[PDB]
């Protein structure tokens, strides 16, 4: 078997070679490619990239934050993870016109879309219990009842809610798939930062799969990563060039430390990564 | 230059070889693979598969039917396309607790979601003008004014309208991409009947790209076909393996006979398939 990270590095080679120049919303400033797909096996290994360190604590703590259904960036920052803070800033919110929202109010992002799709969004601290659609539970339930179902889909893209978010999700939807008691997951990521973003988004959905496969009593299969606008920022061309030279270490292993039955009962101390020795930045 | 149809036949060979037994809703009866991707060029050619004849009239009529905001299957059947009739059947409906619902009424399917996303569906006759997000136009608008946008997405998956609709979309969403005056499109297909529905599905979203590009004054680039549950029904295996022995004829071309300002002004008589030489069956 070849390494799973060799797909990610190969995707960088392609963008560096055949990628064309394209700007984002600020004028920057990228080398882009439209349409990619890589498959990462989760079978007795966890696709946490090794040619550079990945913020696993950020990965883990953000997902639980999503699963909680939280939409307040302060509730995440308390755990020492700051990747969402600047979007709930007391000035950036007014930049989008959201002057009425208090500090932290991202609007109807992932956690709200996952647990309460369709619901009318009030504030961060409003209780949306039983309101909307808990498609995360619908996923877990459907897997338990009809594993053959070709509809196990959790969509975070709500066209009604787009003008109310800090920014539209880079992960439109994910779809789950069960065969031979193996749970597999495909993620559709509309936009991907191969340098900074992408490695984080592989761990995040490999983790979710590991969570659901644990609950539904299945064993993790493949994680399919599908990209739309796969781009490399020009100020990363050289650091990525040197990283391509590095050789992938053996993937670590994600292990759950207690039998968890419900999904909202998962805590950051239930997961342990062992054997993770990445390259130095 | 490698022929684009080889990807389709290639996918089939993989599923026949590395595919596993997986059933569907009705106990049948397939060979499944989760996660596929193929790229079909739209540059000076149209990916109408030629190893077997594709029902282009149906491909063309169904899409105009979509743009029409239609959910009545008989509006399409009246055009010589009988592919949604059994789904809008007076019996198929009763087999889904839609005994209160009239025949042809497929529910909040594609045509509704594209033109009126987020609107309270009632029936196939009420007009939902000024209701629901017009995703189809918002796409065209954003392409005209902001081609760098990494958010041009037409999502047809609405977990709220999932009860009310007959068949939940096999085509969850499609994303558009513009660089160097080239419009590209990627479809995320929830499930794919390889030897039956897939060639039809490919031609559908290529045409849509050809339409939108024509409207937006652009030259079509690539159509990326991402698949989730890609499957082959057991009774298609031998007909498909004979089809595997065929060498693909050069793809036809799609000429637009006139000049259309708005997407709604499109008519069947504006298109002309040229150079289509498919194998028989």
Residue numbers in the entry:
A (entry chain A), B (entry chain C): 26 to 306
What do the authors say?
The only de novo biosynthetic pathway to generate dTTP (2′-deoxythymidine-5′-triphosphate) requires reductive methylation of dUMP (2′-deoxyuridine-5′-monophosphate) to dTMP (2′-deoxythymidine-5′-monophosphate) by TS. The TS enzyme is an obligatory homodimer whose subunits associate with nanomolar affinity to form a dimer that adopts an asymmetric conformation upon substrate binding. Inhibition of TS leads to the cessation of DNA replication and thymineless death of proliferating cells, which renders the enzyme an attractive target for cancer chemotherapy. Ligand-free TS protein binds its own mRNA and thereby represses translation.
To gain direct insight into the molecular recognition of mRNA by hTS, we attempted co-crystallization of the enzyme with oligonucleotide constructs representing the TS site 1 motif. X-ray data sets were collected and structures determined for crystals grown at low salt (100 mM buffer) as well as high salt (1.75 M ammonium sulphate) concentration. Molecular replacement with previously published hTS coordinates furnished structures with the enzyme adopting either of the previously observed active and inactive conformations of the loop regions about I108-G129 and A181-A197; however, each without RNA bound. In the active conformation, the catalytic C195 is located in the active site, while it resides at the dimer interface in the inactive conformation. Crystallization of hTS at low salt may have led to discrimination against RNA ligand binding by crystal contacts that involve the putative RNA-binding region. Although the crystallography effort furnished structures of the protein in both the active and inactive conformation, co-crystallization of an hTS–RNA complex remained elusive.
